[PDB]
UniProtKB/Swiss-Prot annotation, chain B:
Monomer. This is Galactose/lactose metabolism regulatory protein GAL80. Present with 784 molecules/cell in log phase SD medium. This protein is a negative regulator for the gene expression of the lactose/galactose metabolic genes. It binds to GAL4 and so blocks transcriptional activation by it, in the absence of an inducing sugar. The lineage of its organism: Eukaryota, Fungi, Dikarya, Ascomycota, Saccharomycotina. The keyword RNA-binding does not apply. One of its GO terms (cellular component) is nucleus. It comes from Saccharomyces cerevisiae (strain ATCC 204508 / S288c). It holds the Pfam family GFO_IDH_MocA. Keywords: Acetylation, Carbohydrate metabolism, DNA-binding, Galactose metabolism, Repressor, Transcription, Transcription regulation.
Length: 390, 392
């Protein structure tokens, strides 16, 4: 009994679902089957079902028909964040005509605001389905290895943490091929919501702790970006940006009152794309990007440096792949654990399962708080965002 | 010609004045001469004047006699910060009996609190003497080279800055041989006041900007330190610390609203002790040390790529004595006008961001206001506007 997958945002010729979700589902052909597909232009659906040989997938005409169908067990939404609310709300409502629906899978970010995120959570929860959020960083071999080392005491207690990252396209330059919408505030995609969001979430996941207090400063020091061509050359035309080009973030982890210092540049470096330095009482641990490297440093007049590196791990489809596998594994209870619940509220810091919309919701609360902290100009108590309900 | 110097805190057998100030004055024997010396135990003064062959120095019995003497042109105070206020205040008062006094040289930190610092500044200012503060980092060859590059546009506009450092002695351990007062709050020596103070001051000096807004979190996560021996082994005895073991600091530079992120540990086997990363629109600049001991500048059939790294490194440079030496040098050059450029008064309020001169008690005061604000930010849990701290 293969999980039947209804897909919104899959296009064989365009988009990133074809580049991440599809390869994963293709490899787990046993555990998953695409039985439904929807998009405004019913053509590309049909086109895709053909171009990919999806002999079980039928192209639905309306969102209503799509959502009502009973040939669907898991719905995946892989469209722009700005469209999440407008699509998911009605979808969840029509969903009520599908007695078989068990799963709703949404990409991060969940929505364009905490308000929206809360509405979607509420609607999903009052729908009864198990939810998944694409925080696929939680499935990285590197993240999982670092989480084990830390929780098993190899690091000792954590003294302090530093993080330095880049957001890619939020510096001085903008590829002409890049959609305006992702540079306008409130469209659910930006340096803080997205890049910092994925990163600060894996940080909490790895150290198994939420924050107690935070302070942030959010910058738009680059209100106008220079258009560039494919070759990297400027086109002599400026365009406006209302999303941030820098984030300064500092805070304390609840567990141990651990100092965390973080700096995210919008743009590009004249280096490593991401570094997370975790300083322990027994060892230091470092994760590095272009999350493709894990370093462990310690001592027996002698220093030891140990480097964990996978080749050739493709993180992009690989992390998603493992998320898809988790959904199968929790579903089919493969480890055959009697106690395992049929559904959970949230992964939290568990190795098990997969992050849900509640994990997404808590992250949204942290992101809202980052922006609030900047606006208010004060350090904020965020100790209860994981458990207040709300 | 020679600048006549009276010294409080110089001891040929003990202390750091003998290790930093003395070597400097020894080398500039022409421009400087030690004509006076004072300490509570009049013996060690006499001992030192002998053990060093200071044939012009006389050992004064009281602070009053010392400060009143007219054989003194520049007074140097190199004693523990906790003693600065109690010594300098009366000294400045007795100082009035010395028509020749032109200079007052004090080490950082100026005092144990902003309140004290303001009193000292006020008393010094209403005394008329030119003041110097030992922010000798402003005289490092690495700092000056970085400042020059930045000021000349070599890195473009500053986009952002990160600073990571350690304070050395405020981690999970303390040497049994170590002075208790270094670890007790309010004695004018600590991770924020001292280590962060020297560092954040050179940052502002190199970028020629003060801060607009700041937020800090100050930690005492290590209320009890483990005593260690000379070999590095623990003695199985814990002692209390009320000074911080970590500082998180973030803020914006007034000029350009530049994001600055900073983390100082109290507190790997082969790391760097201090790194300042300055990211420019054209080039990146990095200063590192285990003190500053290295400056690096970085620029960046199919389409080619060219990277250029320049490293500036003076091997065998003793920053400790070197920096203080270069401070003394900058003093006499002002004093003797070695640049021979008139007309320049025999006195200025503050170095500010000038390459010229040397930092004064006003530069110290402004730094104290910043340090005071770091602690306020932490206690209030607010981001503070410090834009006006450099005014009077």
């Amino acid at each position: 009994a293969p999980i039947r997958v209804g897909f919104v945002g899959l296009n064989a010729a365009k988009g990133w679902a074809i580049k991440t979700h599809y390869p994963a589902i293709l490899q787990l052909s046993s555990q998953f089957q695409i039985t439904a597909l929807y998009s405004p232009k019913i053509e590309t659906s049909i086109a895709t079902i053909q171009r990919l040989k999806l002999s079980n997938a039928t192209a639905f005409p309306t969102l209503e028909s799509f959502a009502s169908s009973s040939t669907i067990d898991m719905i995946v939404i892989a469209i722009q964040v700005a469209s999440h609310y407008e699509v998911v709300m009605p979808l969840l409502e029509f969903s009520k005509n599908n007695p078989n629906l068990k799963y709703l899978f949404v990409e991060w970010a969940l929505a364009c605001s905490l308000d929206q995120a809360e509405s979607i959570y509420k609607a999903a929860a009052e729908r009864g389905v198990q939810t998944i959020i694409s925080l696929q960083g939680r499935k990285s071999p590197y993240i999982l290895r670092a989480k084990e080392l830390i929780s098993q005491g190899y690091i000792g207690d954590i003294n302090s943490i530093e993080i330095a990252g880049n957001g890619g396209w939020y510096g001085y330059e903008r590829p002409v091929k890049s959609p305006k919408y992702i540079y306008e505030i409130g469209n659910g995609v930006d340096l803080v919501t997205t890049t910092f969001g994925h990163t600060i979430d894996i940080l909490q996941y790895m150290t198994s702790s939420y924050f107690s207090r935070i302070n942030a400063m959010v910058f738009n020091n680059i209100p106008e970006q220079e258009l560039i061509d494919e070759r990297g050359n400027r086109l002599g035309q400026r365009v406006p940006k209302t999303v941030p080009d820098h984030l300064l973030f500092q805070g304390t982890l609840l567990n141990g009152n651990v100092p965390v210092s973080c700096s995210f540049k919008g743009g590009k470096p004249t280096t490593k794309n991401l570094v997370i330095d975790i300083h322990g009482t027994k060892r230091d641990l470092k994760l590095e990007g272009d999350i493709s490297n894990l370093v462990l440093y310690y001592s027996g007049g002698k220093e030891i440096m140990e480097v964990y590196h996978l080749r050739n791990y493709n993180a992009i489809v690989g992390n998603i792949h493992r998320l898809y596998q988790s959904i199968s594994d929790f579903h089919f209870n493969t480890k055959k654990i009697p106690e395992l619940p049929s559904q959970f509220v949230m992964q939290g810091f568990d190795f098990e399962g997969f992050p849900t919309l509640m994990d997404a919701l808590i992250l949204h609360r942290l992101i809202e708080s980052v922006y609030k902290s900047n606006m208010m100009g004060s350090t904020l108590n965020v100790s209860n965002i994981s458990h207040y309900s709300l």
